């Protein structure tokens, strides 16, 4: 418990920063004292630093024991500074590492895969509707995938963000854009499937490239409009101990707005689509099983993959929104945020994988994709 004592220290430090009464301050300072005490000419110096730390903790503890909450918290701020000098004098979380691995593989597979898919569907885009659909999906996923290397770099550098406020606003939002764009596109495609099965005459009367392209345009516009509100609430914050730059969201003094965003994102981005699409393909699959399945199964697989890979993000998000920022579970989930987002990001590379698998179940790669997406 080398890193763990320090983790308890910073966690309880944030607890003191967000303390309700003197009692919580005292308890947190007690845990900090225990963790600081729990932790050669170099060993004498690190132990010296730990001693100064424990001393300041005891001072703050005296203050808390008196009844001066604010003053004890001030002493704790100073504690943060000295702790910073002592730690800077002398590791990354497992979930962040998993997030790095996932980000990497999703980047490779997403970039190469969706570049190949775009290449393939581009030939037949204005000749076949399915090509339009798959093209739009691939473009969404790829565009989202372009943001990954910078996120990777930032995570490797312990959340440090040297790319500016604008980039901080736009690049991390691209995955959300990918979510909405994906779900709207998929919804339109699902409508198309339904009509192909139950109202074919409409399809003989309506279907042209134009309607598909318009539907795509509206899907994209709506996705952008659904993405901008969160985009505007992205802000950078400079940390002074140790010096670095953080990129994040800012719902400060507006917890209700945070909850609102979490809820709206859950409903419009997951639950409503789950309901409607499940109804849709219940219809379609029951009819089919009572009687083009090659493409249909692919579409179904993609739809399922959406919810499969978005589920943890949504769960952790909502739960986090209903938790106090000073609660241990909240801090845990906060630490798990990047991993959940990576798991969500798997959606931006899973499509070419599905296409390749179905194609293999049909037995060159672009030729195979041509045959699958047509």
């Amino acid at each position: 418990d080398l890193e763990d004592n320090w983790e308890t220290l910073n966690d309880n430090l944030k607890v003191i920063e967000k303390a309700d009464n003197a009692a919580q301050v005292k308890d947190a300072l007690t845990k900090m004292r225990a963790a600081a005490l729990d932790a050669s000419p170099e060993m004498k110096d690190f132990r010296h630093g730990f001693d100064i730390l424990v001393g300041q903790i005891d001072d703050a503890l005296k203050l808390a024991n008196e009844g001066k909450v604010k003053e004890a918290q001030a002493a704790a701020e100073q504690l943060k500074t000295t702790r910073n000098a002592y730690i800077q004098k002398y590791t990354l979380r497992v979930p962040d590492i998993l997030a790095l691995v996932i980000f990497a593989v999703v980047f490779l597979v997403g970039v190469l895969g969706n570049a190949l898919v775009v290449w393939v569907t581009a030939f037949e885009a204005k000749r076949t509707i399915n090509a339009i659909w798959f093209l739009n999906l691939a473009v969404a996923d790829f565009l989202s995938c372009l943001a990954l290397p910078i996120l990777f770099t930032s995570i490797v550098q312990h959340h440090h963000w040297p790319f500016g406020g604008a980039a901080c606003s736009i690049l991390p939002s691209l995955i959300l854009l990918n979510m909405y764009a994906s779900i709207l596109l998929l919804a339109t495609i699902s409508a198309d499937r339904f009509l192909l099965v139950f109202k074919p005459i409409w399809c003989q009367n309506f279907r042209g490239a134009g309607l598909a392209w318009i539907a795509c345009a509206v899907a994209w516009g709506l996705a952008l409009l659904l993405t901008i509100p969160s985009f505007l609430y992205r802000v950078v914050r400079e940390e002074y101990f140790p010096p670095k730059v953080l990129c994040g969201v800012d719902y400060s003094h507006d917890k209700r707005r945070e909850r609102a965003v979490a809820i709206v994102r859950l409903v419009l981005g997951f639950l409503w689509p789950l309901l409607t699409l499940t109804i849709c393909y219940t219809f379609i699959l029951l009819r089919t099983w009572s009687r083009s399945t090659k493409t249909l199964k692919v579409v179904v697989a993609v739809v399922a993959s959406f919810f499969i890979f978005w589920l943890p993000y949504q769960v952790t998000g909502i739960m986090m929104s209903f938790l106090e920022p000073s609660s241990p579970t909240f801090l845990l989930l906060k630490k798990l945020d990047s991993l959940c987002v990576s798991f969500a990001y798997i959606n931006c590379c899973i499509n070419p994988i599905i296409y390749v698998v179905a194609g293999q179940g049909f037995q060159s790669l672009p030729s195979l994709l041509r045959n699958v997406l047509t």
Partner: peptide
């Protein structure tokens, strides 16, 4: 404030 996405 919260770094990242949430």
């Amino acid at each position: 404030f919260a770094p990242x996405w949430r």
